From Swiss-Prot, chain C:
UniProt function note: DNA-dependent RNA polymerases catalyze the transcription of DNA into RNA using the four ribonucleoside triphosphates as substrates. Common component of RNA polymerases I, II and III which synthesize ribosomal RNA precursors, mRNA precursors and many functional non-coding RNAs, and small RNAs, such as 5S rRNA and tRNAs, respectively. Pol II is the central component of the basal RNA polymerase II transcription machinery. RNA polymerases are composed of mobile elements that move relative to each other.
Subunit structure of this chain's protein: Component of the RNA polymerase I (Pol I), RNA polymerase II (Pol II) and RNA polymerase III (Pol III) complexes. Component of the RNA polymerase I (Pol I) complex consisting of 14 subunits: RPA135, RPA190, RPC40, RPA14, RPB5, RPO26, RPA43, RPB8, RPA12, RPB10, RPC19, RPC10, RPA49 and RPA34. The complex is composed of a horseshoe-shaped core containing ten subunits (RPA135, RPA190, RPB5, RPO26, RPB8, RPB10, RPC10, RPA12, RPC19 and RPC40) where RPA135 and RPA190 form the DNA-binding cleft.
Additional facts recorded: Present with 6090 molecules/cell in log phase SD medium.
Signal peptide: none
Family that this chain belongs to: Belongs to the archaeal Rpo6/eukaryotic RPB6 RNA polymerase subunit family.
Species of origin: Saccharomyces cerevisiae (strain ATCC 204508 / S288c)
One GO CC term on file: RNA polymerase II, core complex
Region named Leucine-zipper: 57-78
Stretch of the intact protein here: 55 to 154 of 155
Keyword Transmembrane helix on entry: no
Keyword Transferase: no
UniProtKB/Swiss-Prot annotation, chain D:
Modification(s) after translation: The N-terminus is blocked.
UniProt GO BP: nucleolar large rRNA transcription by RNA polymerase I; ribosome biogenesis; RNA-templated transcription; termination of RNA polymerase I transcription; termination of RNA polymerase III transcription; transcription by RNA polymerase I; transcription by RNA polymerase II; transcription by RNA polymerase III
Part of the full-length chain shown: 26 to 70 of 70
Zn finger region (C4-type): 6-26
Record protein name field: DNA-directed RNA polymerases I, II, and III subunit RPABC4
Spans traversing the lipid bilayer: none
Lineage start: Eukaryota, Fungi, Dikarya, Ascomycota, Saccharomycotina
Swiss-Prot record, chain E:
Name the record gives this protein: DNA-directed RNA polymerase I subunit RPA190
Binding site residues for Mg(2+): 274, 276, 278
Residues of the full protein shown: 344 to 637 of 1664
Additional remark text: Present with 2840 molecules/cell in log phase SD medium.
Record's subcellular location: Nucleus, Nucleolus
Organism of this sequence: Saccharomyces cerevisiae (strain ATCC 204508 / S288c)
Gene: RPA190
UniProtKB/Swiss-Prot annotation, chain K:
Additional free-text comment from the UniProt record: Three distinct zinc-containing RNA polymerases are found in eukaryotic nuclei: polymerase I for the ribosomal RNA precursor, polymerase II for the mRNA precursor, and polymerase III for 5S and tRNA genes. Present with 14100 molecules/cell in log phase SD medium.
Protein name: DNA-directed RNA polymerase I subunit RPA135
Superkingdom of origin organism: Eukaryota
Subunit structure: Component of the RNA polymerase I (Pol I) complex consisting of 14 subunits: RPA135, RPA190, RPC40, RPA14, RPB5, RPO26, RPA43, RPB8, RPA12, RPB10, RPC19, RPC10, RPA49 and RPA34. The complex is composed of a horseshoe-shaped core containing ten subunits (RPA135, RPA190, RPB5, RPO26, RPB8, RPB10, RPC10, RPA12, RPC19 and RPC40) where RPA135 and RPA190 form the DNA-binding cleft. Outside of the core, RPA14 and RPA43 form the stalk that mediates interactions with transcription initiation factors and newly synthesized RNA.
Portion of the full-length sequence here: 803 to 917 of 1203
Compartments (UniProt record): Nucleus, Nucleolus
Family under the similarity heading: Belongs to the RNA polymerase beta chain family.
Organism classification: Eukaryota, Fungi, Dikarya, Ascomycota, Saccharomycotina
Length: 97, 107, 100, 45, 284, 47, 202, 97, 70, 504, 115
């Protein structure tokens, strides 16, 4: 903490919810490539270590435009070709079925 | 002091529309401009123009990432003071599909 | 400007219903040892950030000891806001609280 | 001269390169390094 | 539901996963050997079955046994998305001592994430040492070794009443005890004092009240990170903390020539302390 | 049983009001017991 | 449907108060007055003098720059009023000190005087330079505006000072003086400079 | 005793820096860098299982740069024929020798 | 190159510096030329008892424009 | 044969309308070569390129024509052109940054960053700087953040700190609005140099370097002419050579160049017509805020000692502005004791002072002290130490220091004393405060040996009885800081000889 | 207190993988000041005061083409007591790749010692 850096806005309450399929507006990456490295160890684009998910291995980030020191990282989505359910809510969809 | 101010105190950015930690982004501007912090899912992309009898954007609602994608809207952010594990908590609940919404009521 | 005119006016009216007037306030006339610890914490944190001091700091170099002298002369310009558990509150100034 | 000591028969010895770790006299595979004239300082405490 | 939105049944179903960012998915390493992240081992497995069912869908595009492989894919694309979220809810091979515990077991244990990393944390500006007895300090004090004393610091803001103390603290520097170790300017940038001579340190010490000519930071002032002095405060605790008197506030008394924390006998009843190899933590 | 109660709150659309001390340390808000059960306000002299 | 879903999109980009022309001339009225509400910090050093603090911290960096939330360039402020955190005008108000820092946040009202040009507005200004690429003007002796070539009519010629510059002469054989009248096409929030993109077409 | 990595600023020099508390990094003249994360882990042969065999190795204060192929190998695949002596190829000089 | 570091300082928009929120609280209402002249007389004289003296000069080119001639 | 090359850029100009940006990436690359690389552009092909852009900039403004503007902006060494190629390049910037004033954001990054060059080298850098400050009035606000951004580092060479400041003094002339900012940027960055020089300097005994032939060192540098992926981990021998003799001439070169400039700017006509008062206001309101809260610092307060001593008007707004500091009620203690310290040594060490201003000071002082002994003698014998009266003890030293260096002023033909000094000092020395014991030992014994020779008051018996009868440490160290002690700067002292009184 | 450390250079190498790294120094690729603690064979002089950070033996590896020295990392300063260099029996006629080094840590009675 610094006492010379005040914060004006504070959190008062936390709502719980479910992310719906508007992840598409959120994440515009669509991680498809199952290969995570290559030869020469570089991140292959479309893989899990893609450079639009944050800076990595002394690369600038694709979306953040910042190095590892200042990027937050960003979330990527995997398209599932079918609606696989959620094992959190499974015992409760099994009751409404 | 022993659990926030001297362990993992991070001043993070939060959108005051969707109430989220991880959807914010600082844009990749012109080199003759200033970057600002913008939400992603509150921002609608610039290939969603729909139509004083007409609309036109005030040139400051439009921001870009380094991928080149323009986005309209997605502003209304501010900075809060959270522990850093609450970022790691939020991301490891998104991987379960769970959305935490934060209400930043002193604004 | 249509929403904010009403959303403010709801907020300042809700905040007036929870303010307890000075003749109706019912809590203790004493400073309750946590009010005393936070007043000296908050005042010393203001003194160290160049707030104007209202006491002769007679060669004292400690911000926490400066506020302990302003508290003895009733010179701290702070206000305790005591929240009752439904959110309503009483405003007690530091000058009118008895100090243990 | 950098030297070693055979650990079985106490015969002094030195090895350079393409030289097996063995005693020339017996054939002992364990060699212990000898100490040469080199300054170390101590407080007498 | 003031937003009056509809409870939809696709809240139970996942048409997309989301992947945590790169910072939250760094590769693990032990010894000096980099491994691949555990979160990525059971996530590309979802991303191969996303591709196995994708080529197998093209066989349906030209039109038995291909459905026996298609229904086999729907079990494992469920049994892998079950493994990214839990680890006992996806049984799979059932061979015992299952690795990659999934994003639930990261949240649930004695360790978990809540207990080990939210409810309790590890802290900066703390110390610990074996304690020793002392009848010659006060009963409310603690005897701090000079090893601890020139390491723990306090961010003192510089003002018109402490500039006499804080000049000498910058002049003494990181080795003489009533000293300092960093100054922080009004733009938040830190200036370390470790390599400097007394001339660079007397240069900095005579500039603590000089206003930087900015307009964004005319409110702020500098901060000297002074060492821990005799007027400072310390929370001491014997570690099994049964009651709140086992974590009390002591006054600092910096004692030369000593290598352990040093405590009065009147404090040994409250900490359940005997001086036989016990340690106490010192939070500043 | 962390995710067990978490499922019970997501199905319930629950607004955590952040007033128990375990909920305040998670979000980093100041605790409401002792020195956090009141506010301090500075009385400023000019209109 | 999508006829009331898009109200959270389309209503957000519609500027409310258009600019009317004045004295039956044609030049629009762009200097407007807007009342706002600020949520600002207050220093511990301005705690004996709270209004001078709000002026020197938050209001003075805001003048003569473009602000997003008013759509114009802030020319000044009149009637700054700290909202009291004690409902009960009075001299001794009180603001709320944050728990971690010694800084106090409060609400304030003030009336801005922002300058608000829109499309189709008609502005005046003295011509600063002119070339065979554009004309450049200063609106109210302070605001940059460039009328580029693809918005100037075809039938005008650029006379050439043959050694060192030169007039942009219209179809009438008139070298144009300073005071020009042109219509706004676009307004720029490019950098830290506000520039009006204008036309001369009908 | 300085170790490499990224470049340096603090208005002087692109070089290697001086870390102060093994994860906090300073410059050579007393100006501070930001957030070294200092990858460490605890040991509970145990702690799961030795899963696979993959050749990735730390040599550059953190992520992998060692155990990378075909970059230091060209002058190593020819040292056998050149450095050792008396190769027995001597046919006509042996008529002279 | 040197515009690309100290980029939190190149943001330069802390909570001490810029307000937290600004909301328009009514509809903006147009003033006349007779009133901006009476405003800018008051606003410039009040700030002539720092910063802002690089922006008063921009106002004094605005003030002179409404009642005179370059 | 220069026309076919002028058709290649005009054929390239509509290729963004073909939407490729292909041949532009070889044209625009070709002009941004370094200025030692002979495949750059020349003055023929530049004027070929320039006026294709000065007439048809309507489509370079696109999102892909942007890059060639960068190469025109970062066309390095650009002031080295002949005037039929230079004044056409100056004509291009005056229209590019007026067509699209998104580029005045970016071009002024180059204009301020070349103020390192001398005055005669940047006649064009200041012409473009004067001009857009009239054209874009909203550029005082962010070119200001370019002045402090491109100020050079202190441990660099010496030509940058003497010539970046000299081109910056050109700025204050043709840039009246940006004035209080110029002096705040300089005075704050002299102290970075002034402060590291006294702690490199010896004691109060004068230091001589025994150098009869001084070092001109005009030739002290080279000629003005101006990796492999990783490096490998390295070792010691940073070898920071300290500012022993370098930072003595850094403060010679700069602080002489400052007071040369203000010798012009205050004059008996700018005190009426220009802003000769305005330079005196922008330094006095920079005196009591910047240099007056510094410790242990010679060599900077000679500037106000040199400005005020020009004209007699400037003493009547600095001998009373110093009393605005040194006798107030709203101010803290150590501001007042350091300013009463400034009081006695300004009046004693300034030759151009008139005697109409000496007893203008020395009567207000004796009026304060005699009013003090009236109200507060009965607070001596009570509870409390003698540290309650640090103000009185500082003022009594501030009075006796005047008498040590200006005693022949207080006489007349008769030998009388103004303000009754033999009646004053015989009364105040023997008071219950006893101001001989709690003041500076060297200057109160200096006073004893003089006021016996002047036969004003006798105090050796009390000095003898005080040291037979006999925190505090930093209070004595204000009483030992004489601000206008003589100088270390070997070149700035020469102009002070006309102004500064020596020890005898 | 005495402590032995086994410095081993066959710990990573497969049985089929030939010999990569060698005790000693590699020429023309040189950090100095390692020669205050270490000897020509890349082994420490015995009797030498070491601290944490100090080099405890040097080696030259063929792959990275570098001169690499192992570092002693313990908070207790020690002296090199004995250096045994271990020959091989199974794979005969091969060069030196196993060295055990014994330290001694002197332990005067400190405050806190239990008698
Ligand atoms: Zn540096």
């Amino acid at each position: 903490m610094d006492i010379s850096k005040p914060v004006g806005s504070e959190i008062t309450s936390v709502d719980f919810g479910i992310l719906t399929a508007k992840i598409r507006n959120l994440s515009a990456k669509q991680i498809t490539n199952p290969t995570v490295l290559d030869n020469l160890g570089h991140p292959v684009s479309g893989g899990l270590y893609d450079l639009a998910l944050g800076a990595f291995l002394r690369n600038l980030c694709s979306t953040c435009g910042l190095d590892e020191k200042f990027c937050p990282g960003h979330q990527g989505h995997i398209e599932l070709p079918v609606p696989c359910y959620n094992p959190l809510f499974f015992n409760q969809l099994y009751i409404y079925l | 002091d022993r659990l926030l101010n001297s362990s993992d105190y991070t001043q993070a950015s939060v959108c005051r529309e969707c109430g989220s930690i991880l959807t914010t982004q600082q844009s990749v501007p012109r080199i003759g401009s200033i970057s600002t912090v913008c939400c992603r899912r509150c921002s609608m992309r610039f290939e969603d123009a729909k139509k004083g009898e007409k609309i036109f954007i005030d040139d400051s609602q439009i921001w870009e990432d380094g991928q080149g994608n323009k986005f309209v809207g997605g502003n209304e952010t501010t900075t809060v003071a959270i522990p850093f594990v609450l970022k790691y908590l939020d991301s490891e609940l998104s991987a379960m599909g769970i959305r935490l919404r934060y209400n930043v009521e002193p604004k | 400007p249509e929403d904010f005119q009403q959303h403010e006016q709801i907020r300042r009216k809700t905040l007036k219903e929870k303010a307890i007037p000075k003749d109706q306030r019912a809590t203790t006339p004493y400073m309750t040892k946590y009010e005393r610890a936070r007043i000296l914490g908050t005042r010393a944190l203001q003194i160290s950030m160049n707030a104007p001091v209202f006491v002769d700091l007679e060669g004292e170099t400690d911000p926490l000891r400066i506020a302990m002298k302003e508290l003895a002369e009733k010179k701290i310009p702070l206000v305790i806001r005591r929240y009752l558990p439904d959110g309503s509150f009483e405003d007690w100034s530091v000058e009118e609280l008895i100090v243990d | 001269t950098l030297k070693y000591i055979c650990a079985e028969c106490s015969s002094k010895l030195s090895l350079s390169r393409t030289d097996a770790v063995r005693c020339k006299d017996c054939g002992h595979r364990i060699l212990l390094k000898a100490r040469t004239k080199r300054l170390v300082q101590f407080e007498a405490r | 539901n003031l937003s009056r939105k509809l409870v939809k049944a696709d809240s139970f179903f996942m048409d997309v996963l989301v992947v945590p960012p790169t910072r939250f998915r760094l590769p693990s390493k032990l010894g000096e050997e980099v491994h691949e992240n555990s979160q990525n081992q059971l996530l590309s497995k979802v991303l191969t079955t996303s591709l196995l069912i994708r080529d197998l869908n093209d066989d349906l595009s030209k039109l038995r046994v291909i459905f026996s492989r298609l229904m086999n894919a729907f079990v494992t694309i469920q049994n892998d998305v079950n493994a990214f979220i839990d680890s006992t809810k996806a049984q799979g091979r059932t061979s015992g001592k299952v690795p990659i515990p999934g994003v639930k077991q990261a949240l649930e244990k004695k360790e978990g994430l809540f207990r080990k990393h939210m409810m309790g944390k590890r802290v900066n500006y703390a110390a610990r040492s074996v304690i020793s007895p002392d009848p010659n300090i006060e009963t409310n004090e603690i005897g701090v070794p000079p090893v601890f004393a020139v390491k723990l610091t306090y961010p003192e803001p510089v003002t018109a009443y402490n500039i006499a103390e804080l000049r000498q603290a910058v002049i003494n520097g990181p080795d003489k005890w009533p000293g300092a170790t960093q100054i922080q300017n009004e733009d938040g940038s830190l200036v370390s004092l470790i390599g400097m001579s007394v001339e660079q340190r007397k240069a900095l010490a005579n500039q603590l009240l000089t206003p930087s000519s900015n307009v964004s930071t005319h409110t702020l002032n500098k901060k000297v990170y002074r060492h821990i002095k005799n007027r400072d405060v310390v929370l001491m605790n014997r570690q099994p903390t049964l009651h709140k008197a086992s974590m009390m506030g002591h006054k600092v008394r910096v004692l030369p020539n000593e290598k352990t924390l040093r405590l009065h006998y009147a404090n040994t009843g409250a900490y359940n302390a005997d001086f036989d190899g016990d340690e106490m933590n010192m939070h500043f | 049983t962390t995710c067990q109660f978490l499922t019970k709150a997501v199905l319930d659309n629950e607004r955590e009001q952040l007033d128990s001390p375990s909920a305040r340390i998670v979000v980093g808000k100041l605790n409401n017991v002792g020195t956090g059960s009141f506010d301090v306000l500075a009385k400023v002299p000019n209109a | 449907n999508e006829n009331r879903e898009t109200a959270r999109f389309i209503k957000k980009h519609k500027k409310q108060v258009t600019n009317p022309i004045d004295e039956k001339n044609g030049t629009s009225n762009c200097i407007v007055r807007v009342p706002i509400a600020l949520y600002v910090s207050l220093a511990p050093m301005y705690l004996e003098n709270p209004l001078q603090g709000v002026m020197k911290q938050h209001l003075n960096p805001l003048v003569m720059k473009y602000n997003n939330k008013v759509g114009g360039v802030v020319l000044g402020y009149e009637g700054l009023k700290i909202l009291d955190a004690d409902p009960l005008d009075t001299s001794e108000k009180l603001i709320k000190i944050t728990p971690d820092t010694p800084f106090g946040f409060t609400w304030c009202h003030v009336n801005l005087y922002v300058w608000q040009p829109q499309v189709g507005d008609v502005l005046e200004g003295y011509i600063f330079i002119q070339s065979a690429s554009h004309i450049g003007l200063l609106i109210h002796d302070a605001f940059n505006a460039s009328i580029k070539k693809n918005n100037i009519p075809v039938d005008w010629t650029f006379v050439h000072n043959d050694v060192e510059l030169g007039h942009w002469v219209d179809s009438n054989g008139e070298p144009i003086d300073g005071k020009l009248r042109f219509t706004v096409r676009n307004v720029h929030t490019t950098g830290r400079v506000v520039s009006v993109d204008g036309t001369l077409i009908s | 005793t300085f170790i490499r990595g990224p470049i340096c600023g603090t208005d002087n020099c692109p070089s290697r820096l001086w870390r102060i508390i093994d994860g906090r990094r300073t410059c050579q003249y007393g100006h501070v860098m930001e957030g070294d994360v200092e990858f460490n882990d605890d040991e509970d042969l145990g702690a799961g299982v030795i899963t696979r065999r993959l050749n990735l190795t730390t040599n550059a204060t953190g992520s992998f740069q060692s155990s990378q192929l075909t970059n230091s190998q060209l002058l190593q695949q020819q040292q056998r024929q050149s450095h050792k002596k008396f190769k027995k190829l001597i046919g006509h000089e042996a008529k002279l020798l | 190159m040197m515009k690309g570091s100290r980029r939190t300082g190149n943001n330069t928009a802390t909570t001490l510096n810029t307000p937290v929120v600004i909301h328009a609280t009514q509809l903006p209402q147009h003033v006349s030329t007779d009133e901006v002249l009476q405003f800018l007389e008051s606003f410039i004289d009040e700030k002539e008892n720092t910063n802002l003296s690089s922006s008063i000069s921009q106002l004094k080119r605005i003030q002179r424009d409404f009642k005179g001639l370059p | 044969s220069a026309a076919m090359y002028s058709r290649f850029v005009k054929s390239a100009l509509d290729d963004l309308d073909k939407n490729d940006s292909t041949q532009i990436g070889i044209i625009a690359n070709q002009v941004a070569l370094p200025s030692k690389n002979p495949e750059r552009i020349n003055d023929k092909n530049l004027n070929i390129l320039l006026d294709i852009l000065s007439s048809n900039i309507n489509r370079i403004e696109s999102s892909r024509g942007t890059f060639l503007i960068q190469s025109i902006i970062n066309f390095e060494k650009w002031w080295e052109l002949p005037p039929h190629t230079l004044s056409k390049y100056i004509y291009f910037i005056k229209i590019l940054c007026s067509s699209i004033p998104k580029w005045w954001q970016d071009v002024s990054m180059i204009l301020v960053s070349c103020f390192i060059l001398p005055i005669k080298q940047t006649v064009c850098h200041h012409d473009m700087l004067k001009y857009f400050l009239r054209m874009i009035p909203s550029s005082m606000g962010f070119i200001d953040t370019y002045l402090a951004k491109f100020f050079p580092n202190k441990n660099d060479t010496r030509r940058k700190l003497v010539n970046y400041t000299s081109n910056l003094l050109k700025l204050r002339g043709y840039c009246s609005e940006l004035g209080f900012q110029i002096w705040s940027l300089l005075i704050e960055k002299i102290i970075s140099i002034d402060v590291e020089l006294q702690n490199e300097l010896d004691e109060l005994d004068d230091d001589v370097d025994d150098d009869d032939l001084e070092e001109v060192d005009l030739e002290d540098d080279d000629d003005l002419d101006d990796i492999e992926g990783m490096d490998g981990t390295e070792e010691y021998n940073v070898e920071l050579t300290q500012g022993i003799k370098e930072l003595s001439t850094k403060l010679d070169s700069i602080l002489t160049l400052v007071s040369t400039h203000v010798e012009e700017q205050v004059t008996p006509e700018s005190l009426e017509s220009g802003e000769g008062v305005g330079v005196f206001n922008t330094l006095t309101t920079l005196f009591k805020t910047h240099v007056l809260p510094t410790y242990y610092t010679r060599s900077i307060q000679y500037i106000m000692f040199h400005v005020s001593q020009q004209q007699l008007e400037l003493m009547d707004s600095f001998l009373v502005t110093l009393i605005d500091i040194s006798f107030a009620v709203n101010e803290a203690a150590e501001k007042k004791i350091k300013s009463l310290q400034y009081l006695g040594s300004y009046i004693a060490r300034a030759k151009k002072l008139s005697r109409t201003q000496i007893i203008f000071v020395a009567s207000y002082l004796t009026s304060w002290l005699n009013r003090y002994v009236i109200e507060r003698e009965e607070e001596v014998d009570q509870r409390g130490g003698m540290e309650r009266f640090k103000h009185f003890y500082a003022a009594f030293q501030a009075l006796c220091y005047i008498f040590c260096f200006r005693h022949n002023i207080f006489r007349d033909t008769d030998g009388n004393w103004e303000c009754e000094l033999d009646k004053f000092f015989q009364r105040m020395v023997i008071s219950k405060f006893n101001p001989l014991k709690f003041c500076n030992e060297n200057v109160m014994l200096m006073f004893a040996r003089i006021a016996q020779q002047e036969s004003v008051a006798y105090c050796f018996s009390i000095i003898e009885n005080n040291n037979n009868e006999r925190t505090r440490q930093q209070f004595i160290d204000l009483q030992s800081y004489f601000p206008y002690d003589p100088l270390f700067l070997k070149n700035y002292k020469i102009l002070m000889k006309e102004y500064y009184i020596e020890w005898s | 207190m005495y402590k032995t450390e086994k410095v081993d250079l066959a710990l990573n190498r497969n049985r089929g993988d030939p010999i990569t790294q060698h005790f000693g120094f590699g020429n023309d690729e040189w950090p100095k000041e390692w020669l205050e603690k270490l000897d020509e064979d890349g082994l420490p002089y015995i009797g030498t005061y070491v601290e944490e950070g100090d080099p405890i033996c040097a080696y030259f590896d063929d792959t990275l083409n570098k001169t690499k020295i192992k570092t002693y990392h313990s908070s207790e300063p020690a002296y090199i007591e004995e250096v045994n260099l271990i020959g091989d029996e199974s794979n005969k006629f091969q060069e030196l790749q196993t060295v055990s080094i014994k330290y001694r840590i002197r332990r005067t009675p400190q405050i806190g010692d239990k008698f």
